[PDB]
């Protein structure tokens, strides 16, 4: 085989050139933009090859760690556009550190706890910042952040009684949920609701009445899921929908066959990463939204007794995804991003890493099979495909809260 | 009156007409996390927003204030919510507000709050007369703006404006036939009007799509639409289609075509087709071809299909 200091890459095989776009000599904005990215990605790919010498890929853990550690405390005014998403910035950054297996100092953890306490609304849930009305986006983030910390201090900050009432004040009769009082409706809300409801153990039989049916109505002709019935299939909304139904144990309400074929077709044959919608550009953050769908599907199919399921791999190109993230998505200065030419940000950092972890780890039943491309150190901590927080963290939290009664219900 | 960037703009803490109310600083606690180093202007406006909100001051001054808070951060849903409360309490001219939102959306077309705001305004006025034209302008700048398409579907369905959408669809498909958001809108318009059960409609669509496939063979959108409008009934239900594709294969053996063929075989085997052994064999050969050469990025998916076919139809 190869010496330990050289590792052949899928993206560098001579035949990989064949995967370049074929625009049938008919150019439109779509092919033109796709070709441009491909041109840049080929350049990047080539920079990691030195004829028959192909050095091991390296995740720059330390540079990332220092970028994160800084942001957890302070952020420039460039983040003014996320002032209504601070608990979300919390979750992004903590999960990134979690994935990187970088410990959280007791002091920082307690400060985060207090901050999230200040963001909790008296009517229940969490807002984008202190004094802000509650919103499922930040509510989702705030609960995940508290579960990543996993201390009883963190756990108890959540006012479960009001949280349930808040979920109720957003429930629509057709099964859907508003994102916040007087707000917009789409599948993100069903996933936020179910995520926090199941973790904190506050699910009542009626809370999610008609929700699975509503989510199914969101799967479309493409096979993926849209934000609302009728809209285009989209990686983000699709992750939201499936994970929500997995929580409700209703995955069967969807055409899993069309969904599987849709999502696998979303991995770019040349880039190795995922696009969010058919005929759109590759983007590092979909590495999780899209690729994350495979483990959910595997679980759904496995529960149905599918005899043809793999016992060692996810139904996507795990290596290819790892090559896209490691060679195209890292900022030399630390942090990860969309694609070469884009600037870093905590959102992309969180999700690029989330996907890299799903791409390196396979698990099903008593079967575990890792595929860590590059230097061994690249290995990231596993992540729960439904909640996207440490699997250990999910178990700890659910165990804790299962010990408390469902607020005012029996 | 005066914008945040106007030369004559004056911080709220310096405005005489605001002197009577004390600004409410944001309480981030003694040891802040994810603390944003706001600009003086930003903090100024938010300290005063906090004040009016805390006091629930339904005033014209507060209403003007939200406009500045929104320009500072249009993603702040709390401001938006309060703004709508004021629109009602003060009985503001909603047509004036529509012009406002129109400008806002033009500046930031990928924001959730702005579109939701415009939908609320259209609900209140029960007036969609400006919708299609406006949306079309947004789409003219970004043909695939998701929020734009979603809003358009809502307007059409809620106010039953189907009459000219299919034409719109063709227009855009001519501009960029790779626009997946447009193929979706097509399914949206047809399934909601004539439906696809009319066999004359189905044939028109199958023809149109095949014609687009011939013009641009590697355009995945068309292929997905073809499989989309025929899948429910069953790909194996359309025997001529298989023949046509088999004829094009030697000259257009793209992964899309080969894949479509496996999809057909799949459905055939599922409906007790004749020559089961022969069909299975051709299907497995294609799965291998896609996994090893034509669509390797999906090697695992194809290998799975291969095994599924065997577990379901080997006998």
């Amino acid at each position: 085989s190869s010496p330990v200091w050289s590792e052949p890459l899928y993206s560098l095989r001579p035949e990989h050139a064949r995967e370049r776009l074929q625009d049938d000599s008919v150019e439109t904005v779509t092919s033109i933009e796709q070709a441009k990215v491909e041109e840049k990605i080929q350049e990047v790919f080539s920079s990691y090859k030195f004829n028959h010498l192909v050095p091991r890929l390296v995740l720059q853990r330390e540079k990332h760690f220092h970028y994160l550690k800084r942001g957890l405390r302070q952020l420039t005014d460039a983040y003014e556009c996320l002032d209504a998403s601070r608990p979300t910035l919390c979750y992004w950054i903590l999960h990134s550190l979690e994935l990187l297996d970088e410990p959280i100092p007791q002091i920082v953890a307690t400060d985060v706890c207090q901050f999230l306490e200040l963001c909790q609304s008296p009517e229940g849930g969490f807002g984008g910042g202190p004094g802000q009305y509650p919103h499922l986006a930040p509510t989702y983030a705030a609960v995940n952040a508290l579960c990543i910390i996993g201390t009883e201090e963190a756990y108890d900050i959540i006012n479960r009684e009001k949280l349930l009432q808040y979920l109720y004040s957003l429930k629509q009769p057709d099964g859907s949920f508003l994102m916040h009082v007087g707000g917009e409706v789409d599948v993100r809300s069903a996933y936020c609701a179910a995520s926090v409801a199941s973790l904190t153990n506050i699910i009542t039989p009626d809370l999610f009445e008609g929700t699975a049916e509503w989510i199914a109505r969101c799967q479309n002709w493409e096979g993926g899921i849209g934000g609302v019935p009728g809209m285009e299939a989209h990686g983000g909304y699709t992750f939201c929908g499936l994970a929500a139904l997995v929580i409700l144990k209703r995955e069967r309400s969807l055409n899993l066959k069309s969904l599987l074929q849709w999502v696998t077709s979303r991995q770019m044959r040349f880039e190795g990463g995922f696009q969010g919608r058919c005929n759109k550009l590759v983007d590092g953050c979909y590495s999780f939204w899209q690729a994350g769908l495979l483990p959910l599907l595997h679980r759904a199919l496995h529960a149905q007794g599918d005899p043809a399921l793999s016992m060692s791999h996810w139904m996507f190109h795990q290596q290819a995804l790892q090559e896209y993230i490691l060679m195209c998505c890292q900022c030399p200065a630390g942090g990860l991003l969309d694609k070469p030419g884009k600037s870093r940000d905590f959102y992309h950092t969180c999700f690029c890493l989330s996907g890299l972890s799903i791409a390196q780890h396979f698990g099903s039943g008593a079967m575990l099979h890792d595929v860590v491309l590059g230097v061994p150190e690249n290995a990231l901590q596993p992540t729960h495909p439904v909640y996207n927080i440490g699997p250990d963290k999910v178990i700890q939290a659910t165990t804790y809260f299962l010990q408390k009664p469902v607020p005012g219900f029996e | 009156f005066v914008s945040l960037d106007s030369p004559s703009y004056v911080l709220y803490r310096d405005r005489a007409e605001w002197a009577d109310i004390d600004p409410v600083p944001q309480n981030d606690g003694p040891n802040p996390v994810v603390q944003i180093i706001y600009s003086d202007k930003f903090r100024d406006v938010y300290d005063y927003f906090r004040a009016v909100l805390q006091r629930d001051e339904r005033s014209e001054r507060a209403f003007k204030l939200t406009r500045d808070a929104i320009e500072l951060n249009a993603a702040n849903y709390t401001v938006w919510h309060f703004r709508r409360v004021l629109l009602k309490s003060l009985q503001k001219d909603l047509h004036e507000e529509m012009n406002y939102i129109t400008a806002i959306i033009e500046e930031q077309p990928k924001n959730y709050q702005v579109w939701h705001h415009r939908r609320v305004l259209v609900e209140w006025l029960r007036d969609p007369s400006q919708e299609l034209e406006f949306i079309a302008d947004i789409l003219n700048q970004d043909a695939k703006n998701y929020h734009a398409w979603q809003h358009r579907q809502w307007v059409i369905q809620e106010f039953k404006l189907w009459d000219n959408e299919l034409q719109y669809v063709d227009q855009l498909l001519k501009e960029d036939v790779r626009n997946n958001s447009v193929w979706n809108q097509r399914y949206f318009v047809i399934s909601n009007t004539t439906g696809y059960n009319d066999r004359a409609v189905l044939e028109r669509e199958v023809q149109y799509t095949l014609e687009m496939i011939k013009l641009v063979p590697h355009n995945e959108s068309a292929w997905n639409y073809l499989k989309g409008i025929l899948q429910d009934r069953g790909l194996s239900k359309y025997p001529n289609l298989l023949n046509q594709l088999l004829d094009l294969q030697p000259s257009h053996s793209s992964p899309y075509l080969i894949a479509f063929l496996v999809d057909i075989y799949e459905d055939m085997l599922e409906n007790q087709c004749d020559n089961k052994e022969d069909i299975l064999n051709k299907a497995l050969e294609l799965c291998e071809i896609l996994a090893k050469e034509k669509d390797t990025i999906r090697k695992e998916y194809w290998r799975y299909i291969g095994r599924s076919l065997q577990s379901k139809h080997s006998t």
């Binding site: 209504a84 979300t88 919103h135 986006a137 994102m179 953050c285 969309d338 | -």
Partner: peptide, 4 residues
Amino acid sequence: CVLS
């Protein structure tokens, strides 16, 4: 890329 805004989530909310």
